[PDB]
């Protein structure tokens, strides 16, 4: 049994190493220690000091260099060192910030990235490979109760699975974290585990969905070389017997804007670089492709390569995945034509004509785009610079200037890419949709909390999703738990754990008074609105009124929201246009006539191409965002949730470098310590009257 065998890989990579005789001596010491700040302005940088004396209300301790004194009520005592490396931190004698961090630190220094914190799992990103995800590791975890085996994403996955069978109830695994923390990697481990333990081709197709979704939906940002720029909820589906019977991917809004613009050091989506690096000799000839430096949508950020990644090798993995899932050869070629066409569209350079209207003097890129898409270039040209619209009921050809022509071309590009993404997902699901499910375990992998030099509408939506997810944790851990105690009169005094995201949520998405998103939508159907009337409207409603909002004095185009994870300043530029997400009808008419079988689906299939109405306007991006979020939250309310809190060690994407201030900020806003305390102070288990404990109006409660 590898669990009891100290030579096994399990012991070597999942268990704390045996301490030596010098450590034992230290472990049986009578000395006592405190965690203190050498500099009181740096409250997250701690050292260990020996307590050398006490009064009834104070401790005196030695610093690393001088004696100091602290009130016992302000003291962060160090746990006895026998607790260092403990698998479940609810066991600590002293529950405080430096002590929790220290325990994570002891584990992380030994490459033990997983630790329990009461009822939920903490996962600290290693930023290197650790050999704990093999089939042999999978086999050790199968069927084991949580307390029987070391902390691992596989263990929580198995717990959910056994709960699904024993309770005949759908489960969810909610993996939180800021950008780069490890959500996507852990998600993939859950799916790997479930597919193995509940498995019977289908299982391979489930796994091979991922390189396809990542190639099209992930990119390098300044926070993560493999950032997910769309959120997803993966339902792994099981029959009544508990075997895997299929899977369904709900994807959420994609950051389409990245197709046409990337900040310094970032990349566009991986697929672009994969194609250009990986394509056949005259694949590149048939698609009129050169290197990335030749394309406006790839040559602006200054970064075309990611350290440690071969885009040519990745392209081969993407294509192998498309084969397994079952995209035909013609389909793959059409997918790649669309990618190449987008790059050509980006190279179109509009210029000022005789008047205010734009012209196209060089039609090389236009012609190359048109060829690969199978559309008529003259029609495309007219649709870009002279689109027809209604003025009342009259049909009037516009003549767009350079900036509008360029923005229209960008709109077409973003629509092509976002529809293609949707089509990939729909094609994947149709293959994985083979049996009506009896049960599901859903795994949620959103885009994580993120802050850049410039934060836009996408960032607000991402960060709001994260705030909502933290609120869901808070609701399940603290609010529902104490509501149960109190309805069942078990002698409980309500505790205010001080984590309530409601104010921030209401600021962003309130209905009365209207929040940010509601005011955005109102401005978006107001004919005279501009980005400046928008920001003026937000300040008018929130400045000096809402405690989570800030009108900054240093800018007239930004506003601040205090999120759980910190304040973010958002730049209002282009919000109205991003929210309305327009595309000229004449561009649609152009592409509806495509000779390509995939392009034509993107423009004629109503599930991909049609856009809902509300009254006389198309649904905004904000309303679409809200529908998707409300849909997720409704599904989650029908599941039994399990939480994994992914923690990023630093902001450099480096191994072996656990940064104090970075980690402690996360432990705090995640509610980790509060979560451990409710587990310790409360009563996790209860049963209708069955035929350190308590008696409810209808149930016995215990621990
Ligand atoms: N458990 C893991 N083992 C090895 N590397 C990991 C692990 N978790 C995260 N990483 C590394 O961190 C990167 C970012 O993690 P990811 O899961 O993509 O973050 P996100 O939370 O933004 O989805 C990964 O590409 C990988 O390099
Ligand atoms: C549940 C949910 C609902 C909407 C979402 C998300 C998740 C995301 O993670 C994103 O898919 C990540 C990017 N994003 C987005 C992109 C552009 C505009 C608005 C939101 C997101 N919207
Ligand atoms: O960088 V992550 O968007 O995948 O949170
Ligand atoms: Mg991710
Ligand atoms: Mg700024």
Describe this structure in words.
- The chain has 703 residues and is α+β, with helices and mostly antiparallel strands.
- The protein is 43% helix and 16% strand.
- Helix 13 (377-385) runs antiparallel to helix 20, helix 15 packs across helix 16 (502-509) and helix 17 runs antiparallel to helix 18.
- The protein is globular.
- The PDB classes it as contractile protein.
User: What portion of residues belong to β-strands?
Assistant: 15-25%
CATH T-level topology of the domain at 457-578 and 625-638: Methane Monooxygenase Hydroxylase, Chain G, domain 1
Q: Can you tell me the CATH architecture of the domain at 457-578 and 625-638? A: Up-down Bundle
For the CA atoms, what is the radius of gyration? 28 Å
Structure class: alpha+beta
**CA-CA gap between termini:** 30 Å
What is the CATH domain class of the domain at 457-578 and 625-638?
Mainly Alpha
Number of helices: 25
Helix percentage range = 40-55%
Query: Order of strands across the widest beta sheet?
Result: 6-7-23-8-17-11-12
What ligand molecules are bound, each kind once?
adenosine-5'-diphosphate, ligand BIT, vanadate ion, magnesium ion
The shape is globular
The counted number of beta strands is 26
Largest beta-sheet characterization: 7 strands, mixed
At a glance:
This protein has 703 residues and is α+β, with helices and mostly antiparallel strands. It is globular. The PDB classes it as contractile protein.
């Amino acid at each position: 049994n590898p669990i009891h065998d100290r030579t096994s890989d399990y012991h070597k990579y999942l268990k704390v190493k045996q301490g030596d005789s010098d450590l034992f001596k230290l472990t049986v010491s009578d000395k006592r220690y405190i965690w203190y700040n050498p500099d009181p302005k740096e409250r997250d940088s701690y050292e260990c000091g020996e307590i050398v004396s006490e009064t009834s209300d104070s401790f005196t301790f030695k610093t690393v260099d001088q004696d100091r004194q602290v009130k016992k009520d302000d003291a962060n005592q160090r746990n006895p060192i026998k607790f260092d490396g403990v698998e479940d931190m609810s066991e600590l004698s002293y529950l405080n910030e430096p002590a929790v961090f220290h325990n994570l630190r002891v584990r992380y220094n030994q490459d033990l990235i997983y630790t329990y914190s009461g009822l939920f799992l903490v996962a600290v990103n290693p930023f290197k490979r650790i050999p704990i995800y093999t089939q042999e590791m999978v086999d050790i975890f199968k069927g084991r109760r949580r307390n029987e085996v070391a902390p691992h994403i596989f263990a929580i996955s198995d717990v959910a699975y056994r709960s699904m069978l024993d309770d005949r109830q759908n489960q969810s695994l909610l993996i939180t974290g800021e950008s780069g923390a490890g959500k996507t990697e852990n998600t993939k481990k859950v799916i790997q585990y479930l597919a193995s333990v509940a498995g019977r081709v289908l299982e391979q197709q489930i796994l091979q969905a991922n390189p396809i979704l990542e190639a099209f939906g992930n990119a390098k940002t300044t926070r993560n070389n493999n950032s997910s720029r769309f959120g997803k909820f993966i339902e792994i589906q099981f029959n009544s017997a508990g075997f895997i019977s299929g899977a369904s991917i709900q994807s959420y809004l994609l950051e389409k804007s990245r197709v046409v613009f990337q900040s310094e050091t970032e990349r566009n989506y991986h697929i672009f670089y994969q194609l250009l690096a990986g394509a056949t000799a005259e694949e590149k000839k048939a698609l009129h492709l050169a290197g990335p430096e030749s394309f406006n949508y790839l040559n602006q950020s200054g970064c075309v390569d990611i350290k440690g990644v071969s885009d040519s090798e990745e392209f081969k993995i993407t294509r192998q995945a498309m084969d397994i899932v079952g995209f035909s050869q013609e389909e793959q070629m059409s997918i790649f034509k669309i990618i190449a066409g987008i790059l050509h569209l980006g190279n179109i350079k509009f210029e000022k004509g005789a008047g205010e209207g734009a012209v196209l003097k060089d039609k090389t890129a236009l012609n190359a785009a048109s060829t690969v898409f199978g559309v008529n270039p003259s029609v495309l040209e007219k649709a870009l610079m002279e689109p027809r619209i209604l003025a009342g009921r009259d049909l009037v050809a516009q003549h767009l200037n350079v900036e509008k022509s360029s923005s229209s071309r960008d709109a077409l590009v973003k629509a092509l890419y976002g529809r293609l993404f949707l089509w990939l997902v729909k094609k994947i699901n149709n293959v994985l949709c083979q049996e009506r499910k009896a049960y599901f375990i859903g795994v949620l992998d959103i885009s994580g909390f993120e802050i850049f030099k410039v934060n836009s509408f996408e960032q607000l939506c991402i960060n709001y999703t994260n705030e909502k997810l933290q609120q869901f944790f808070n609701h399940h851990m603290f609010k529902l738990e104490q509501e149960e105690y109190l309805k069942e009169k078990i002698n409980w005094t309500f505790i205010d754990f001080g984590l309530d995201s409601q104010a921030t949520i209401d600021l962003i998405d309130g209905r009365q008074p209207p929040g940010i998103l509601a005011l955005l939508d109102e401005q978006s159907v107001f004919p005279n609105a501009t980005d400046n009337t928008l920001i003026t409207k937000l300040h008018s409603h929130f400045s000096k009124k809402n405690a989570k909002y800030e009108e900054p004095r240093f800018s007239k185009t930004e506003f601040g929201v205090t999120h759980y994870a910190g304040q973010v300043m958002y730049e209002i530029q282009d919000w109205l246009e991003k929210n309305k997400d327009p595309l000229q009808q004449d561009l649609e008419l152009c592409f509806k006539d495509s000779s390509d079988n995939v392009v034509t689906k993107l423009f004629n299939d109503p599930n991909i191409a049609s856009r809902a109405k509300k009254g006389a306007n198309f649904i905004t991006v904000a309303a679409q965002y809200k529908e998707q979020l409300a849909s997720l939250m409704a599904t989650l309310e029908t599941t039994n949730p399990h939480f994994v809190r992914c923690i990023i060690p630093n902001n450099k994407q480096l191994p072996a470098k656990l940064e104090d201030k970075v980690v402690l900020d996360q432990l705090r806003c995640n509610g980790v310590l509060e979560g451990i305390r409710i587990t310790r102070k409360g009563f996790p288990n209860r049963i209708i009257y069955f035929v350190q404990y308590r008696f409810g109006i209808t149930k016995i409660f215990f621990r």
